[PDB]
Amino acid sequence: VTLAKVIKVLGRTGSRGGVTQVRVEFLEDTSRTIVRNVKGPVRENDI
Amino acid sequence: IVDPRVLVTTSRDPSSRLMAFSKEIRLMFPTAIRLNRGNLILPDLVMSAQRERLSDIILLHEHRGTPTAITISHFPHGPTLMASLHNVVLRADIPKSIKGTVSESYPHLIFEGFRTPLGQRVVKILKHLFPPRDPTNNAKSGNRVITFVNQDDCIEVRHHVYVRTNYNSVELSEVGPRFTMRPFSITMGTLE
Amino acid sequence: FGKKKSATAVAHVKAGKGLIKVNGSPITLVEPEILRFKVYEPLLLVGLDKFSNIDIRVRVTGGGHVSQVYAIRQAIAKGLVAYHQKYVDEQSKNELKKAFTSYDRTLLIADSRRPEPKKFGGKGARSRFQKSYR
Amino acid sequence: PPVLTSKDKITKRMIVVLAMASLETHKIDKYVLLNCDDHQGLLKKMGRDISEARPDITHQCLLTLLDSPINKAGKLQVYIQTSRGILIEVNPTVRIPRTFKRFSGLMVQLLHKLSIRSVNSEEKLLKVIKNPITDHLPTKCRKVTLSFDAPVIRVQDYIEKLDDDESICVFVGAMARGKDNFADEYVDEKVGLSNYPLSASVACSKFCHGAEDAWNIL
Amino acid sequence: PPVLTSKDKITKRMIVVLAMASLETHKIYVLLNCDDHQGLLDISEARPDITHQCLLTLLDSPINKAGKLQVYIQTSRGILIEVNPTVRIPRTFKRFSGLMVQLLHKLSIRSVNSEEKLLKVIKNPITDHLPTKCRKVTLSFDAPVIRVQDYIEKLDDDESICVFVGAMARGKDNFADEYVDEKVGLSNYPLSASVACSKFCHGAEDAWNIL
Amino acid sequence: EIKLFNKWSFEEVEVKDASLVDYVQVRQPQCPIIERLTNSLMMNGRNNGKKLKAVRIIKHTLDIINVLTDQNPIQVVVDAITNTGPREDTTRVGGGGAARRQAVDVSPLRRVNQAIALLTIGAREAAFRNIKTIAETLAEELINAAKGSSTSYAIKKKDELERVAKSNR
RNA sequence: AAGGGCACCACCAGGAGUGGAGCCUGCGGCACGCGCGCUACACUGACGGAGCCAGGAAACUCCGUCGUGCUGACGAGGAAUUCCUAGUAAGCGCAAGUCAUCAGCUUGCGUUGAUUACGUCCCUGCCCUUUG
Among D174, D68, D186, which residue's Cα sits nearest to residue D131?
Answer: D186
Neighbours of chain F (3+ CB pairs under 8 A): A, C, D
DSSP notation for B5-72: PEEEEE-SS--HHHHHHHHHH---SSSEEEES-B--STTHHHHHHHHTT-SEEEEEE--SSSTTEEEE
Is F141 in contact with F119 (CB distance < 8 Å)? yes
Q: How far apart (Å, rounded) are the C-alpha atoms in residues B158 and B108?
A: 12
Experimental method: cryo-EM
Q: Which residues are CB-contacts of A41 (< 8 A; sequence separation ≥ 6)?
A: A2, A3, A4, A5
Neighbours of E102 (CB within 10 A): 14
CB contact under 8 A, F154 and D139: yes
Alpha carbon dihedral D7, D9, D13, D15, in 10-degree steps, equals: 60
Report chain C's C-alpha Rg in angstroms.
19
Element (H, E) at D105: helix D100-113
Give the distance from residue C113's alpha carbon to the nearest chain B alpha carbon, in angstroms. Answer: 15
Element (H, E) at E137: strand E134-139
In angstroms, how far is CA E53 from the centroid of its own chain? 11
Is C5 in contact with C62 (CB distance < 8 Å)? no
Q: What is the CATH number of the domain that holds C82?
A: 3.30.230.10
CB contact under 8 A, A44 and F107: no
Residue type, C77: A
Q: Answer whether any strand G atom is within 7 A of the Cβ of B38.
A: yes
Is D70 in contact with D212 (CB distance < 8 Å)? yes
Q: How far apart (Å, rounded) are the C-alpha atoms in residues E86 and D212?
A: 29
Domain locations in chain F as residue ranges = 1-169
What sign does the dihedral D134-D138-D141-D147 (CA atoms) show?
A: negative
Q: How far apart (Å, rounded) are the C-alpha atoms in residues E147 and E199?
A: 9
Q: How far apart (Å, rounded) are the C-alpha atoms in residues B130 and B146?
A: 9
Q: How far apart (Å, rounded) are the C-alpha atoms in residues D138 and D56?
A: 29
Question: Which of F91, F104, F106 lies closest to A44 in CB terms?
Answer: F104
Q: How far apart (Å, rounded) are the C-alpha atoms in residues C111 and C71?
A: 11
Parallel/antiparallel/unpaired status of strands B155-164 and B144-150: antiparallel
F near C: at least 3 beta-carbon pairs less than 8 Å apart: yes
Q: Which residues are CB-contacts of C79 (< 8 A; sequence separation ≥ 6)?
A: C1, C2, C11, C12, C13, C56, C58, C87
How distant, in Å, are the alpha carbons of B111, B123, B184, E57 from that of B149? 6, 10, 17, 74
Q: Which residues are CB-contacts of B120 (< 8 A; sequence separation ≥ 6)?
A: none
Q: What is the CA D21 to C1' G77 distance in angstroms? A: 20
E49-88 b/e (C-beta count within 10 Å ≥ 16 → b): bbbbbbbbbbbbbbbbbbebbbbbbbbbeebbbbbbbbbe
Among E164, E167, E168, which residue's Cα sits nearest to residue E180?
Answer: E164
Q: Which residues are CB-contacts of F62 (< 8 A; sequence separation ≥ 6)?
A: F7, F8, F73, F74, F77, F135, F139
Question: Which of D99, D195, D209 lies closest to E35 in CB terms?
Answer: D99
Is D191 in contact with D152 (CB distance < 8 Å)? yes
Q: What is the CA A4 to C1' G122 distance in angstroms? A: 27
Q: Which of C34, C69, C102 has the highest number of chain F CBs within 10 A, making it the mutation to test binding with F? A: C34
Q: How far apart (Å, rounded) are the C-alpha atoms in residues D162 and C56?
A: 67
Cα angle for residues D97, D101, D106 (degrees, 5° grid): 55
The neighbouring-strand residues paired with B160 are B145, B174
The parent domain of residue C49 ranges over: 1-120
Parallel/antiparallel/unpaired status of strands D87-90 and D115-117: unpaired
- DSSP E strands in chain F: the ranges are none
CB contact under 8 A, C35 and F5: no
DSSP state of E126: G
Residue type, C105: R
Q: How far apart (Å, rounded) are the C-alpha atoms in residues E17 and E122?
A: 13
CB contact under 8 A, D140 and F128: no
Half-sphere exposure of F44 (CA within 13 A, CB side): 21
Q: Would you call D73 an interface residue with chain E, using a CB distance cutoff of 8 Å?
A: yes
Q: Would you call D102 an interface residue with chain E, using a CB distance cutoff of 8 Å?
A: yes
Element (H, E) at C67: helix C65-77
Parallel/antiparallel/unpaired status of strands B179-186 and B155-164: antiparallel
Element (H, E) at E120: strand E117-122
Q: How far apart (Å, rounded) are the C-alpha atoms in residues E45 and E32?
A: 9
E near F: at least 3 beta-carbon pairs less than 8 Å apart: no
D17-55 b/e (C-beta count within 10 Å ≥ 16 → b): bbbbbbbbebeeeeebbbbbebbeeebeeeeebeebbbb
Q: How far apart (Å, rounded) are the C-alpha atoms in residues C78 and C99?
A: 13
Is E133 in contact with E158 (CB distance < 8 Å)? yes
Q: Would you call C119 an interface residue with chain B, using a CB distance cutoff of 8 Å?
A: yes
Domain count, chain C: 1
In angstroms, how far is CA B170 from the centroid of its own chain? 24
CB contact under 8 A, D218 and E187: yes
Residues of B in contact with C113 (CB under 8 A): none
Gapped junctions in chain E, after residues (C–N > 2.5 Å): 28, 41
Q: Would you call E51 an interface residue with chain D, using a CB distance cutoff of 8 Å?
A: no
Q: How far apart (Å, rounded) are the C-alpha atoms in residues E75 and E72?
A: 10
Is D130 in contact with D182 (CB distance < 8 Å)? no
Is B174 in contact with B160 (CB distance < 8 Å)? yes
Element (H, E) at C65: helix C65-77
DSSP state of C88: S
DSSP state of C14: S
Q: Answer whether any strand G atom is within 7 A of the Cβ of B13.
A: yes
* C88 within some domain: yes
Q: How far apart (Å, rounded) are the C-alpha atoms in residues B81 and B72?
A: 6
Residue D40, SS3 per DSSP: helix
Q: Would you call A35 an interface residue with chain F, using a CB distance cutoff of 8 Å?
A: yes
Domains, chain A, ordered by start: 1-47 (2.40.50.140)
Start-to-end CA distance of chain C, whole Å, equals: 56
Q: How far apart (Å, rounded) are the C-alpha atoms in residues D215 and D13?
A: 10
In angstroms, how far is CA C42 from the centroid of its own chain? 9
Chain F, nearest residue to D135 by Cα: F157
Residues of F in contact with D162 (CB under 8 A): none
Residues of D in contact with E199 (CB under 8 A): 209
Report chain D's C-alpha Rg in angstroms.
17
Q: Which residue is nearest to nucleotide G28 (CA to C1')?
A: B90
Is A23 in contact with A47 (CB distance < 8 Å)? yes
How distant, in Å, are the alpha carbons of A4, E15, F17, F162 from that of A35? 12, 61, 10, 15
| CATH architecture of residue range(s) F1-169 | Orthogonal Bundle (1.10)
Residue D108, SS3 per DSSP: helix
Q: Which residue is nearest to nucleotide G52 (CA to C1')?
A: C65
Half-sphere exposure of D61 (CA within 13 A, CB side): 30
Q: Which of C30, C35, C39 has the highest number of chain F CBs within 10 A, making it the mutation to test binding with F? A: C35
Question: Which of F22, F104, F108 lies closest to A46 in CB terms?
Answer: F104
Alpha carbon dihedral B48, B49, B53, B58, in 10-degree steps, equals: 90
Cα angle for residues B102, B103, B106 (degrees, 5° grid): 95
CB contact under 8 A, A45 and F19: no
CB contact under 8 A, C37 and F4: yes
Neighbours of B65 (CB within 10 A): 8
Question: Which of C117, C128, C130 lies closest to B34 in CB terms?
Answer: C128
Q: How far apart (Å, rounded) are the C-alpha atoms in residues E60 and F4?
A: 66
* C83 within some domain: yes
Half-sphere exposure of E172 (CA within 13 A, CB side): 5
Q: How far apart (Å, rounded) are the C-alpha atoms in residues F151 and F133?
A: 22
Residue D71, SS3 per DSSP: helix
The neighbouring-strand residues paired with B174 are B160
How distant, in Å, are the alpha carbons of B20, B57, C10, C57 from that of B26? 10, 11, 46, 54
Instruction: Count interface pairs B-C at CB distance under 8 A.
Output: 134
Q: How far apart (Å, rounded) are the C-alpha atoms in residues B6 and B52?
A: 9
Q: Which residues 113 to 142 of F reach strand G, CB within 7 A?
A: 113-114, 116-117, 124, 126-127, 130-134, 137
Element (H, E) at B171: strand B170-174
Is F123 in contact with F136 (CB distance < 8 Å)? no
Three-state secondary structure readout of F104-139: CCCCCHHHHHHHHHHHHHHHHCCCCCCCCCHHHHHC
Q: Would you call A44 an interface residue with chain F, using a CB distance cutoff of 8 Å?
A: yes
C90-116 b/e (C-beta count within 10 Å ≥ 16 → b): eeebebbbebbbeebebbeebeeeeee
Q: Would you call C112 an interface residue with chain B, using a CB distance cutoff of 8 Å?
A: no
Q: How far apart (Å, rounded) are the C-alpha atoms in residues D179 and D172?
A: 12
How distant, in Å, are the alpha carbons of A31, E20, E120, F72 from that of E51? 69, 9, 16, 64
Q: Which residues 28 to 47 of F reach strand G, CB within 7 A?
A: 29-30, 34, 40, 43-47
Q: Answer whether any strand G atom is within 7 A of the Cβ of D134.
A: no
**What is the phi/psi pair of residue C98, to 5°?**
-40, -25
Q: Answer whether any strand G atom is within 7 A of the Cβ of F63.
A: no
Q: How far apart (Å, rounded) are the C-alpha atoms in residues D208 and E187?
A: 13
CB contact under 8 A, D166 and F156: yes
* C129 within some domain: no
Q: What is the CA B100 to C1' G4 distance in angstroms? A: 17
